Amino acid sequence: PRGLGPLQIWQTDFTLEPRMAPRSWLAVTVDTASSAIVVTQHGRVTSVAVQHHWATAIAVLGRPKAIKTDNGDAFTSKSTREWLARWGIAHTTGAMVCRANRLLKDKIRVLAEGDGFMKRIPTSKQGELLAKAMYALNHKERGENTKTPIQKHWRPTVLTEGPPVKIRIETGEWEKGWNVLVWGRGYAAVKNRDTDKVIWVPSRKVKPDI
Amino acid sequence: GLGPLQIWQTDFTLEPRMAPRSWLAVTVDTASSAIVVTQHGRVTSVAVQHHWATAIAVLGRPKAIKTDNGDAFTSKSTREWLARWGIAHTTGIPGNSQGQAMVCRANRLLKDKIRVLAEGDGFMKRIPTSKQGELLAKAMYALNHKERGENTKTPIQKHWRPTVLTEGPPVKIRIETGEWEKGWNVLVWGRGYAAVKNRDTDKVIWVPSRKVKPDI
């Protein structure tokens, strides 16, 4: 689902960006902890393309412990499975990367239109424009956040232990014995005190214990 | 000089293993020694601008870049590009010391790594086109995320000064008196409370939102 610190869990997807035609496939990875994004451009959705993409992302961000994707063949082929195994990266199929895709496309749109490109970006200007978008997204604050994704990526805040909370389970009851490690707007990461098991739950199902 | 993102050096070097895009644009941050490379079919103003935009996306925006006096660096297109980005630029003789020595060393490091990685994947001459991008990325990973020689710090460490922070910003809390007490750091916020940790006692408590303020 989500990492507690950077380079734990990434999410990756392909998305189509007609402004970047003819090579309009963008491979997008987001680090689920820092929100930093890496994007590369490709002519086709293939196993080879995703391998190049991840190698690029690793060069920028460092090597993750695990990557989550959908069921698509580029991600689950023998070639890609052996590639991930070689790099020692766990893989799951089955979101943050969806929001990353939207932010990226909005940014590409703003930058292109700013250069007078209402439709297709001229082929020779595409690489530069994509890099500019990536710079804006990683090196500038995301809306209301006080730190940029790249700052959160290299200097993350990771609580060693959190404060005690109760969580609402199933019987409608509130259960003690949990501590909160991350408390965001939508979700919270909570750890069971007896096992150190960590689960993600909606914020509304968590409240301070005492 | 001292400090990352102050002075970069950029050069183009030929790497026939990377044909047909055998011109490698190479930038090194002279403080952190971090290297970024992109490949190009020819040395043009467009290639230079793609390269620097890429390097900036990876490393951040530098104050200044030093290059030789090739037409791609001194063109009107590139002059105006640099100006739009607010980056200072100085040119020199190709190979010159004060502005090209470090990037010359980076060229050799990079080409040695490309050779070792390629021959390691069983490619003794030209690297298959479909494998080139990945191999360049792997070379950047190896050059930036591992220590150069006797260094205790990797270029990534010098560039970003990584660390893990274990608490949020300092805060002060309103205690029973009306006094605002310093010596606390916030851990998380939720449901109208802040969880705060006392720097001196390590006590962690939940405090109503309205009774917590940032400390200076």
Residue numbers in the entry:
A (entry chain A): 52 to 145, 154 to 269
B (entry chain B): 54 to 269
Manuscript excerpt for this entry:
The following permanent integration of this viral DNA by the viral-encoded integrase (IN) into the host chromosome is a necessary step in virus replication. In most retrovirus systems, IN first removes a dinucleotide from both termini of the linear blunt-ended viral DNA (∼10 kb), termed 3′ OH processing. Next, the same active sites catalyze the concerted transesterification reactions of the nascent 3′ OH groups into the cell DNA.
In this report, we describe crystallographic analyses of a three-domain RSV IN as well as its CCD-CTD fragment in a new crystal form at a much improved resolution compared to previous studies. Although crystallization of a purified cross-linked IN-DNA complex has not been successful, we have been able to collect a 1.86 Å resolution dataset on a crystal of RSV IN(49–270) cross-linked in crystallo to a short viral DNA end substrate (5/7 hairpin DNA). The crystallized RSV IN (49–270) contained mutations S124D, C125A, E157C, and F199K. As noted by Yang et al., the relative configuration between the CCDs and CTDs of RSV IN is stabilized by a large number of hydrogen bonds made by residues in or around the linker segment. We have provided data rather contrary to this idea; a particular conformation of the CCD and CTD of RSV IN is observed independently of crystal contacts, and appears to be important for viral DNA binding. Our structural and mutation studies collectively suggested a role for the asymmetrically associated CTD dimer of RSV IN in viral DNA binding. The crystal structures, combined with earlier structural studies and our in vitro functional analyses, suggest that the asymmetric interaction between the two CTDs is an essential feature of an RSV IN dimer for viral DNA binding and catalysis, whereas the highly flexible NTD is required for IN tetramerization to promote concerted integration.
